[PDB]
Design a protein around this ligand. Sequence first.
Ligand code: MG
Ligand code: MG
Ligand code: MG
Ligand code: MG
Ligand code: MG
Ligand code: MG
Ligand code: MG
Ligand code: MG
Ligand code: MG
Ligand code: MG
Ligand code: MG
Ligand code: MG
Ligand code: MG
Ligand code: MG
Ligand code: MG
Ligand code: MG
Ligand code: MG
Ligand code: MG
Lengths: 144, 142, 258, 187, 129
Amino acid sequence: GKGKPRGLNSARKLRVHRRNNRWAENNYKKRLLGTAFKSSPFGGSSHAKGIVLEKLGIESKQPNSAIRKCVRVQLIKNGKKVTAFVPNDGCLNFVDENDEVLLAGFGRKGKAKGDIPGVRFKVVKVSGVSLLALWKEKKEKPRS
Amino acid sequence: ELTVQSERAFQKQPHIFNNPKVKTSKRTKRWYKNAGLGFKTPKTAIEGSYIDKKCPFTGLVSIRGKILTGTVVSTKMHRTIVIRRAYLHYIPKYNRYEKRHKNVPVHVSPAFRVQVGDIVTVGQCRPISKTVRFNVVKVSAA
Amino acid sequence: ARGPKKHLKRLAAPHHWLLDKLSGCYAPRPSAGPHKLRESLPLIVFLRNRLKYALNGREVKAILMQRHVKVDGKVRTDTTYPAGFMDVITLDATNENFRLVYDVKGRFAVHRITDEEASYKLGKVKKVQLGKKGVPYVVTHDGRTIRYPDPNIKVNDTVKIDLASGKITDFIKFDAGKLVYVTGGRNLGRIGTIVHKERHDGGFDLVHIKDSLDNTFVTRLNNVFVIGEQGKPYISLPKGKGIKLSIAEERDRRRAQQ
Amino acid sequence: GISRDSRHKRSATGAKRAQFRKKRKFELGRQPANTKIGAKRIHSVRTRGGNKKYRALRIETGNFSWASEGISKKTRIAGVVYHPSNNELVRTNTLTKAAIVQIDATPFRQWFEAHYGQTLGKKSKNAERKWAARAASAKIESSVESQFSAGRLYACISSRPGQSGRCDGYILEGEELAFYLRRLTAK
Amino acid sequence: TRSSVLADALNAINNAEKTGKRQVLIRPSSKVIIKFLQVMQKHGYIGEFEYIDDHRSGKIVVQLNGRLNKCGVISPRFNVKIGDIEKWTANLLPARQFGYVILTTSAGIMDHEEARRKHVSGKILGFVY
RNA sequence: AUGGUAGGAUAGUGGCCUACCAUGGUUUCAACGGGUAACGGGGAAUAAGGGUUCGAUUCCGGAGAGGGAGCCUGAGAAACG
RNA sequence: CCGGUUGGCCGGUCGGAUUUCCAACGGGGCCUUUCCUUCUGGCUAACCUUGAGCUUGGCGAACCAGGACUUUUACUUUGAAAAAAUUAGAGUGUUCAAAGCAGGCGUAUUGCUCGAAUAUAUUAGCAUGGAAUAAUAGAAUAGGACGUUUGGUUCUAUUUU
RNA sequence: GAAUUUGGACAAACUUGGUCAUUUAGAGGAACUAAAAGUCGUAACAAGGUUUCCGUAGGUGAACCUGCGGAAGGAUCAUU
Ligand SMILES: [Mg+2]
Ligand SMILES: [Mg+2]
Ligand SMILES: [Mg+2]
Ligand SMILES: [Mg+2]
Ligand SMILES: [Mg+2]
Ligand SMILES: [Mg+2]
Ligand SMILES: [Mg+2]
Ligand SMILES: [Mg+2]
Ligand SMILES: [Mg+2]
Ligand SMILES: [Mg+2]
Ligand SMILES: [Mg+2]
Ligand SMILES: [Mg+2]
Ligand SMILES: [Mg+2]
Ligand SMILES: [Mg+2]
Ligand SMILES: [Mg+2]
Ligand SMILES: [Mg+2]
Ligand SMILES: [Mg+2]
Ligand SMILES: [Mg+2]
């Protein structure tokens, strides 16, 4: 009889079975436990400002031979330490030190993106100026 | 049903005064009314000697509002029983029903004798107690 | 909270006033009067939005303070005085006389009446009791108290009220074959003869009603207003005569005259 | 202050309610009157909607009705002898409703003489005609007439002194008198 | 154990019509089985059937022509209002021009189109096409 | 705490409170506890059909005026201009 | 037997509809063992009647009223009472449209005039028709149903003497 | 009729504890993941060179080894 009950008064069993088995999912369990509000560095927001600690030369995974040019940043709202990847060619020459950067995710919904081992965020703005505007020389930085 | 006069106060119906001068039959003036809605006033209320201020027939309450039906599941209070109203609740997603129930504390007059398992119909009155808002008007099962 | 409300937002006002949803946050809240604020029409919306004799509430106040309009023979220089069902409204400049009756769409109609008819109104009795010193009274549907009534007048009858004196001219009883007006509910505005009434002890007596095209319907007894015997009514009915043509017949009738 | 609401109590299931609302004024409660005897002192209370309410403190006299005789006289109150709610009200001489008191009984004996012409316990022609015409009604009871020999009648307070200010009552009679007499003479 | 004798009847008829047989024995032959078969017979989906009276419940031998694709039961008997009939017919009929949803309404057992003519609804029993 | 009888208080009904009495009342059909990044509803977005997610926010109801508690005036406030 | 809708019919005006009509679908009345309860009155509904074919004298729902006896549900149909806005949608050239609830027509000087529809809105409560499908009850140590019986206890209580 | 004052109910708060729901420091551990041209063997995959795996117990630098009962997912569908 296909598993599940079929009787006309058996809605309670179907409801509680659906709740119990809804816990087996990924997105539902994450939303209902609220791990984004508790165990996420951004705390569930899309973006976050932080202060650059140092500049890292993280090497990519196999097979890929490169140095990926990320930075360590301490978040302003949490004080949490975070690694952020500075996206384009030559753009690490803007992100020097003690700066206010704005950070976003990479799009992989909390996962490390590519051959880059263990970074989950990218840099968007440095010192209030966006990184592509600096890269395309539309604008230029303040002194500090 | 062994004495009427058990409390420290004199139990009596208010403003029903029996004149000590006269001597007739029909020993005491007993006030009774019909509760309405086709409910018959029981003979045990008309002929009895109990006082029962919250009675729908001899006492000072009026029946107005909902008329409900339940089954007696408890008689362990004094002049008070708990009935159980069973209903089916529909859930639209799964397109079927589930068994639910509520417990209603109702006041029972000494005109009526209920046991556990009897079906009763009750009538809404004003608040009798902290939980009681209903009053037994007809016991018609066993 | 904390006391009675004095404002009335637009989109909360009764829909039959036909106030447009733009042009202001507020609607004219009817002041306390002879009629309930939902089943009422303030003189501001009657003078401005129905008769177009004014363009502003300021002009409605300017009309009212020179004592032009009077409602049921009394002057009433109040902007939000609730004029209700069967009230007469007299505009002595233009010598005009209106009665508030519903059209079949459920809204208050501009029903011009003659000068002989403005001398009375009908009232549905809401309760008959004995006041102090054993004097009986009736209470009509607009809250008029009339002392020493006829002993035959029970509830849900209509009494004809004189409006120069507050006296009762005659009265229509409640039984089968009586012409009724539906004031309330889904069928608001329809006129039909009563066929029979259902006892329903404990609440909400129903009454079955059929119009001149033999369409039956049923209504609670709260929304029924007897207006006479079948054939003659005791007042002049508005245009349409409470018939409730369907939308098919309505666009057919509109394509006749167009 | 004293609140009259039910939201501060437990549910019928026994759960503790959370504080939904601060104490509202339309659910208030006021301290008791505790009406003593002697030297009349009536305060006023302004209550909801205007609507004055008379707290009697320390009332002295009362209007008491003889129900079988159909009269009522303004009589002095001697003291409370019984209360079905509390014995400390009997001790402290507080006057509430349903308090069994002793009253003076001299206006009642004056009315009984002036109405029937026979004295209780142990001249003109018009009065003779009146007193002869209402004969065979001058035999009231044994218990009440023995109280009339003792000059103190048992009455029951039917008024609420803390609400109206007045302490009205009726003389105990019949089976209710026998019930309270068994209560009083009980050791 | 046997909860639905009508479901067992319709399953036996389906197995018979798959195998190409012209007859099938139904056991145990309730009233609803007779009325369901009478609905199938009036539209021309089965043919003649005979009720054998043993004294316990009855058996039925139905004669099968080649016209039936699938007769089914809907268990449980869901409560069906009048818009629900059109959603049920759209879900479980192969086209909008043939096939019948059979439903037990208070005016007897009938198909969905005669229920539309009488303006009556009820509980759904099965289907036939 | 659940009920009974009397009183008190209230605008009024009621364990609302007191005195005396009885031992009740809820719960696997989920009581009681915990959590809510929870004011509720009309409603919104996205959906073949069924659904899923949201609704602090133009209207309706509730609550609050830094946190608590108490009160005056008044028809109406436990009022915070 | 009888009427109800869609047809159908001389295409009657050259795409309008007078029903003697075929047909399909949907109801009602009566009989066939078919109780699917009726204690009091006015009024008599059909009606005994009926005038030579409008007459004076039979059955209470045919019209109500009064009381009295009531197995209990789930389900479904119809309807009432469900706030506007928002949703679907009718009318209307905001210059189009999103909108809005306006507007249109004259001799435009005394003016005249159509509108502001309608539908959806669960679950619960309420009124109603159905009675298939699922339940529930009943007469078995008869304490059963009847009853013109033949009575005895016992309770009211009118008009009246 | 003002100050002042007795009892009461309402009750903000305060002081001394004691529970639980929350953070920091923290000698040390104790793992897991990723990335890593490391060290020692070769447990599994072929009968992987002692068939493999399960449960349980003991032992051992490390894989693992050994006893007892089981499985074929075996290397045998097979001796009228
Ligand atoms: Mg079932
Ligand atoms: Mg994962
Ligand atoms: Mg790869
Ligand atoms: Mg406000
Ligand atoms: Mg106003
Ligand atoms: Mg009380
Ligand atoms: Mg009590
Ligand atoms: Mg919150
Ligand atoms: Mg918030
Ligand atoms: Mg608001
Ligand atoms: Mg407030
Ligand atoms: Mg602030
Ligand atoms: Mg405050
Ligand atoms: Mg402020
Ligand atoms: Mg090995
Ligand atoms: Mg090896
Ligand atoms: Mg090996
Ligand atoms: Mg191997």
